[PDB]
């Protein structure tokens, strides 16, 4: 197994996957690494299993159909994995915890949103459709772009949104387009 967390790239108290060489901090894995379970399989491995069981699941889909899906166990897992892929980028730090807004010439968003809030909402089964999760994720970056206006720091929202969107297309097998 790797000697660093797959998500934050630090050593520490690491749990090792039994079916692949990845390792995790307890609360870096999503869901949080399970108490017992021998053997244990990481989220990467669980996602690969879904694909292998249903190879047609990789055929292209329309985004509108994906968003309307109910959050049954496989869609729950896919959203947890997508969230974890965002935390894998170091730039997620800017979006992880609760923000506050006090900048001359800007007003804070009407509906603040952050990654740890989406993480809690997934854990608490607060989303009934994929659309709820995706809307809160896109709201993070939209709030950031609107608040930071012409400051170059706006770019951090474009960067981490691009990681979200590429992973969304991959994980939910969105039909490739020009």
When asked if residue 25 is in the footprint of Zn ion (CB under 5 A), the reply is yes
| Binding status of residue 28 toward Zn ion by CB under 5 A | yes
Q: Which of 14, 15, 17, 119 binds Zn ion (CB under 5 A)?
A: 17
Nearest approach in angstroms of CB 82 to Zn ion is 17
d(CA 6, CA 24): 6
Asked whether 135 and 142 are in contact (CB, 8 A), the reply is no
Residue 20 engages Zn ion in binding (rule: CB under 5 A): yes
Residues touching Zn ion, count (CB under 5 A): 11
- Options 18-26, 69-77, 93-101, 140-148: segment touching Zn ion (CB under 5 A): 18-26
Letters for 54-73 (x = contact with Zn ion by CB under 5 A, - = none) are x-------------------
Q: Cα–Cα–Cα angle for 23, 35, 94, nearest 5°? A: 55
Phi, psi angle pair for 134, to nearest 5°: -65, -40
What gap in Å lies between CA 87 and CA 130, rounded to an integer? 19
Nearer to Zn ion, 7 or 71 (CB): 7
DSSP assignment of 131-171: HHHHHHHHHHHHHHHHHHTTSTTHHHHHHHHHHHHHHHHHH
Stretch of residues binding Zn ion (CB under 5 A), selected from 53-61, 77-85, 111-119, 155-163: 53-61
CA distance 22 to 11: 12
Residue 7 in contact with Zn ion, rule: CB under 5 A: yes
Using CB under 5 A as the binding rule, whether residue 45 contacts Zn ion is answered as yes
For Zn ion, the binding residues (CB under 5 A) are: 5, 7-8, 17, 20, 25, 28, 42, 44-45, 54
């Amino acid at each position: 197994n790797s000697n660093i967390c797959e998500v934050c790239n630090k050593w520490g108290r690491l749990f090792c996957c039994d079916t692949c060489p990845r390792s995790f901090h307890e609360h870096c894995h999503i869901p949080s690494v399970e108490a017992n379970k021998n053997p244990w399989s990481c989220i990467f491995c669980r996602i690969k299993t879904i694909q292998e069981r249903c190879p047609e699941s990789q055929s292209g889909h329309q985004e509108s159909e994906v968003l309307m899906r109910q959050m049954l166990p496989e869609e729950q897992l896919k959203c947890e994995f997508l969230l974890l892929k965002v935390y894998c980028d170091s730039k997620s730090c800017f979006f992880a915890s609760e923000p506050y807004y006090n900048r001359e010439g800007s007003q804070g968003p009407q509906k603040p949103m952050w990654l740890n809030k989406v993480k809690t909402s997934l854990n608490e089964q607060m989303y009934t459709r994929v659309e709820g999760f995706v809307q809160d994720m896109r709201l993070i970056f939209h709030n950031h772009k609107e608040f930071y206006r012409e400051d170059k720091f706006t770019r951090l929202g474009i960067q981490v949104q691009d990681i979200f969107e590429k992973n969304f297309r991959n994980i939910f097998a969105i039909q490739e387009t020009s």
